[PDB]
Design a protein around this ligand. Structure first.
Ligand code: CDL
Ligand code: ZMP
Ligand code: SF4
Ligand code: SF4
Ligand code: ZN
Lengths: 43, 49, 176, 114, 96, 52, 52, 208, 113, 95
């Protein structure tokens, strides 16, 4: 018989979790960059 | 540079409709200028790509 | 077998508190959302060029109704009224009589397309594949009664669309 | 023959509720003609109120007239609160309906109905 | 798919994700519009013997509801079922 | 066959619009999980009951 | 959402009101190649939830 | 009878019969029948004076805890002199179980409103006022919920026709949507479908 | 161990659950003694209340008391004890151990008709 | 096999045509009466009668599962051909 079936080993794994990849600088580094831009502008 | 290949593909889309006249023909009728392989033409003049 | 959405107690050391304060004052998640919207700006859109490009369909598609014929010109409908008995909206009106050669044929086969719910119970009730719900969906009208099909309109739809309807049935009759 | 009441023990309390409902409709009718900006008069709307009360005047059951007072208060509550539109208020006045044949002869002329 | 690698790198950076491994636009990976003809299996009632309908008549094994008490000791108090077992927290991702 | 598929159930903690939002997003996650388990464990056989 | 309506239409013929799940089972079997495309959808839908 | 027959659940049948005996002997003042179907659902048919004492019990007893009102329903059976059958469907999340509390009324006898037991009922029995005309005494705001505001009659009564008595159209003379006595361009075609042969001999009624 | 949350919104954590359950169960038995002995509600509720009160008197740990009272969190066990108390106070005023107030009509529960 | 009434209106395969004094022809004024011009009673009469050597023939309409339900036509009468009740194809025993 011929029928819509999964393949011989089955389908591969499917991602289903959250992936919010945690990008960006730290809070210390972001305040340091902003204060450095302030000091450059003031100078 | 790959922007040059993009612009060459645009220029050969102009060439692919038989020049600027057929290019503007398909631009103002289809709102779309990309070229395809002509699959066929029916008994009315509709062309399939 | 369950999980707790939103049950994270946030860290209160100076690192994490300064991280949340930098997020508040420097708007980091707002730039994240702007970045995701910018990432869709440079994707190719999903827009097909209708009417020149068409949405994908299948041979099971339930569109405009049609009465079919045999490969001899004889119409398949033998007036058994199964389609109008199964019709969940009572769109089909059938009157029948024996015609001049004594065949069991209809004299009225009406489908009100404005009662029809397009569920195709008629084409699966039909024991001779006479009524089908064909592939046409582009048959909008300017008047309400142009959607009140009689037998002539359904037979003309069958004669018009048979070359496509027969190939769709050839694709799908083994699932039926 | 011993049934459970709704509000009224007998017809006296029932007629009291009918009488209070007629009072409330009589008071409401000019506000209804104003805020719905009806094209009728207060006399005409109060005559329609009187017609709707005297239509049900043959009833001798306290539970039935309790439910009639309940449904009349629901109509009034849907009229004071602007829940009806102008169309729902004017459905009491069958204006677009042609007058029915009342005698035997014109009912014979127009069709088969008794 | 036809995007250049500069726009692809910009796009992957702005999303923070690899967007070419999982395209939301479909290409040649999807199934063919013309398929081989199927051959569907038949059920367990497609037998030529020992296949009487009364031995598999589901609708005629339904009985009227058993009237437990009709109005024409130290027996244990009961509940409609045992009490529900407490759900276990997920081993997969409890968010804990 | 929900006794044969394996999935988690997102439980909120505050009863607000936000936890109900997170529950629906996580039910999309767990629905993808059930769809993977349904695609791998799809059996052969008929699709109507064989009582005609 | 549109691709899942294509899944409905491939399995029944209608994009929304399928009348496909019936008392007794389902009306018709899956067409060949449907489960592969449901796999190709499911493989990518987690990233759609991620960007939502 | 393996593949195509629904498998009978005897454990739930036994447990629901025992709990039905339990309810019938805790509340003999109101409980008239207790029955369990072959697909294992418990029906407690009570007197309409005990809507509040029974449903509070099932909501509050430590072996019942039916803290959820799933559905509230009326059923119009016109050959009964108490033609309306009020059906409560309750869910115990603690004991993972469902119970059905059925009672009766006619057009004129008010049922006591169960909003003090389950607030869920506040619209449901309100629907029973709108669809059936069953009055609920001590309801907070009893009025129509689903029909149009000028609607006369109660539609889910079985002597009420499928189409109404009135239909709407826009009338350009009065510049208004108006109601008129209903005329159909095609009458609804009544189909007499019932076979003249008996289908289920387990449900055969005794003759007169 | 001072459980921080019950998990259920609006159901606050009880600080002293054992003393609360003892007071609620003895108060249930106090109310429930005012019911006649032939009333099955009195017998069944005395039976289950004595079972719950003995389990509360025989377990110091809150978690193990939750696992062997078999009613979820301990605060919803407390809430169900309060619900049973309110029910017993209502069942006194209803007097539902009495005979049936009225027989149904003859074909009232006959389905199908 | 369409024909035409004296009003100039086409007569359908059923035989429906409005009268001259019928007002309901006004619906086709400025428009068209849509008839189908392939009359099935004329098309099935073009099919040649099938000569067979058996006494009973089966007919499913052609196409197997795509035709009609398979019926069995007796051919003992030599006065009359045996017609399929569904498809109208007619058969004759050649002896
Ligand atoms: C920045 C300013 C724009 C510079 C041009 C540009 O970035 O082009 C997009 C070009 C291609 O981007 P892509 O999305 O990866 O290409 C995929 C195409 O679908 C693949 O290209 P294609 O196969 O679709 O090629 C066809 C296309 C060819 O594409 C173009 O002609 C590109 C537009 C040129 C303007 O031609 C058309 O569709 C005709 C468009 C005609 C009007 C274009 C707009 C005119 C604006 C001024 C009036 O971008 C780059 O190559 C990266 C940016 C380079 C910037 C360099 C510094 C300037
Ligand atoms: C704008 C239009 C407004 C439409 C208003 C619709 C409101 C309709 C409310 C209807 C409520 C009733 O009909 S309750 C009346 C039923 N009462 C009875 O059957 C008892 C008999 N009642 C009567 O005879 C009444 O006239 C009186 C006033 C109670 C006593 O009069 P008799 O004495 O002399
Ligand atoms: S598709 Fe359904 S509603 Fe439409 S005519 Fe067929 S059976 Fe009737
Ligand atoms: S279309 Fe089919 S089901 Fe309907 S009357 Fe004709 S043969 Fe019968
Ligand atoms: Zn044939």
């Amino acid at each position: 018989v011929k029928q819509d079936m999964p393949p011989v080993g089955g389908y591969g794994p499917i991602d289903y979790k959250r992936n919010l990849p945690r990008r960006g600088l730290s809070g210390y580094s972001m305040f340091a960059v902003g204060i450095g831009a302030l000091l450059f502008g003031y100078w | 540079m790959e922007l040059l290949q993009v612009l060459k593909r645009g220029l050969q889309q102009v060439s692919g409709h038989g020049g600027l006249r057929g290019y503007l023909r398909v631009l103002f009728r289809a709102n779309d200028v990309r070229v395809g392989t002509l699959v066929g033409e029916d008994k009315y003049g509709n062309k399939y790509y | 077998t369950y999980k707790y959405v939103n049950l994270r107690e946030p860290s209160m050391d100076m690192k994490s508190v300064t991280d949340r304060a930098a997020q508040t004052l420097l708007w980091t998640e707002l730039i994240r959302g702007l970045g995701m919207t910018l990432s869709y700006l440079f994707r190719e859109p999903a827009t097909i060029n209708y009417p020149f490009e068409k949405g994908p369909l299948s041979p099971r598609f339930r569109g405009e109704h049609a009465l079919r014929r045999y490969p001899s010109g004889e119409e398949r409908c033998i007036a058994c009224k199964l389609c109008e008995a199964v019709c969940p909206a009572q769109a089909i009106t059938i009157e029948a009589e024996p015609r001049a050669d004594g065949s069991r044929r209809t004299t009225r086969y009406d489908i009100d397309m404005t009662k029809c719910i397009y569920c195709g119970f008629c084409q699966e009730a039909c024991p001779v594949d006479a009524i089908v719900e064909g592939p046409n969906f582009e048959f909008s009208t300017e008047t309400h009664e142009e959607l009140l099909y009689n037998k002539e309109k359904l037979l003309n739809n069958g004669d018009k669309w048979e070359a496509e309807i027969a190939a769709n049935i050839q694709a799908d009759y083994l699932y039926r | 023959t011993s049934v459970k009441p709704i509000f009224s023990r007998d017809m006296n309390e029932a007629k009291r509720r009918v009488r209070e409902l007629y009072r409330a409709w009589y008071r409401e009718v000019p506000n209804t003609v104003h805020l719905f900006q009806l094209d009728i008069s207060v006399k005409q709307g109060r005559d329609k109120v009187r017609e709707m009360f005297k239509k049900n005047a043959h009833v001798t059951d306290p539970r039935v007239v309790d439910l009639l007072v309940i449904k009349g208060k629901m109509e009034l509550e849907e009229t004071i609160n602007v829940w009806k539109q102008r169309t729902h208020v004017m459905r009491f006045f069958h204006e677009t309906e042609a007058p029915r044949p009342k005698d035997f002869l014109s009912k014979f002329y127009v069709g088969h109905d008794p | 798919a036809s995007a250049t690698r500069l726009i692809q790198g910009l796009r992957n950076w702005a999303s923070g994700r690899d967007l070419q491994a999982k395209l939301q636009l479909r290409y040649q990976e999807i199934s063919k519009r013309t398929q081989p003809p199927p051959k569907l299996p038949v059920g367990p009632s497609h037998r030529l013997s020992n296949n009487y309908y009364c031995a598999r008549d589901g609708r005629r094994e339904a009985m009227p509801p058993s009237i437990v008490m009709s109005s024409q000791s130290e027996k244990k108090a009961v509940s409609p079922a045992p009490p529900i077992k407490r759900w276990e927290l997920s081993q997969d991702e409890p968010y804990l | 066959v929900y006794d044969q598929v394996e999935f988690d159930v997102p439980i909120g903690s505050r009863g607000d619009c936000y936890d109900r939002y997170l529950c629906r997003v996580e039910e999309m996650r767990q629905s993808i999980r059930i769809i993977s388990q349904c695609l791998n464990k799809m059996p052969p056989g008929e699709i109507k009951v064989d009582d005609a | 959402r549109e691709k899942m309506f294509e899944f409905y239409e491939r399995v029944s013929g209608a994009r929304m009101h399928a009348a496909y799940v019936r008392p007794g089972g389902v009306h018709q079997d899956l067409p060949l190649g449907l489960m592969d495309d449901i796999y190709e959808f499911s493989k990518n839908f987690s990233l759609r939830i991620d960007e939502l | 009878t393996r593949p195509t027959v629904r498998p009978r659940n005897d454990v739930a049948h036994k447990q629901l019969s025992a709990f039905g005996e339990y309810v019938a002997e805790i509340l003999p003042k109101y409980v008239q029948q207790v029955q369990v179907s072959c697909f294992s659902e418990l029906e407690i048919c009570i007197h309409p004076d005990g809507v509040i004492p029974v449903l509070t019990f099932l909501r509050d007893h430590s072996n019942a805890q039916f803290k959820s009102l799933a559905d509230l329903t009326a059923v119009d059976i016109p050959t009964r002199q108490n033609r309306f059958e009020i059906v409560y469907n309750l869910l115990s999340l603690r004991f993972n179980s469902r119970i059905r509390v059925k009672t009766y009324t006619d057009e004129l006898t008010p049922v006591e409103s169960s909003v003090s037991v389950y607030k869920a009922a506040n619209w449901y029995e309100r629907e029973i006022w709108d669809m059936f005309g069953v009055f609920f005494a001590n309801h907070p705001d009893l009025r129509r919920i689903l029909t149009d505001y000028g609607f006369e009659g109660h539609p889910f009564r079985k002597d009420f026709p499928l189409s109404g008595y009135v239909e709407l159209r826009y009338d350009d003379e009065v510049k208004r949507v108006v109601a008129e006595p209903v005329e159909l361009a095609q009458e609804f075609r009544k189909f007499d479908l019932n076979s003249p042969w008996e289908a289920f001999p387990a449900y055969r009624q005794p003759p007169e | 161990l001072l459980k921080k949350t019950t998990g259920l919104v609006g159901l606050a954590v009880c600080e002293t659950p054992h003393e609360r359950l003892k007071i609620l169960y003895t108060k249930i038995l106090d109310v429930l003694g005012h019911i006649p002995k032939n009333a099955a509600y009195r017998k069944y509720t005395e039976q289950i209340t004595n079972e719950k009160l003995s389990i509360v008197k025989a377990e110091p740990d809150v978690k193990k008391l939750e696992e062997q009272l078999q009613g979820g969190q301990i605060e919803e066990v407390i809430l169900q004890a309060e619900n049973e108390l309110s029910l017993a106070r209502k069942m006194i005023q209803w007097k539902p151990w009495e005979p049936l107030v009225e027989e149904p009509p003859a074909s009232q529960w006959k389905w199908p008709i | 096999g369409v024909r035409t009434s004296p009003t100039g209106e086409k007569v359908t395969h059923t035989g429906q045509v409005y009268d001259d004094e019928d007002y309901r022809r006004v619906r086709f004024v400025g428009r068209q009466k849509e008839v189908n011009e392939n009359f099935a009673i004329d098309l099935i009469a073009e099919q040649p009668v099938s000569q067979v050597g058996s006494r009973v023939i089966s007919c499913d309409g052609g196409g197997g599962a795509l035709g009609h339900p398979r019926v069995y036509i007796n051919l003992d009468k030599e006065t009359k051909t045996g017609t399929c009740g569904y498809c109208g194809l007619q058969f004759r025993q050649q002896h």
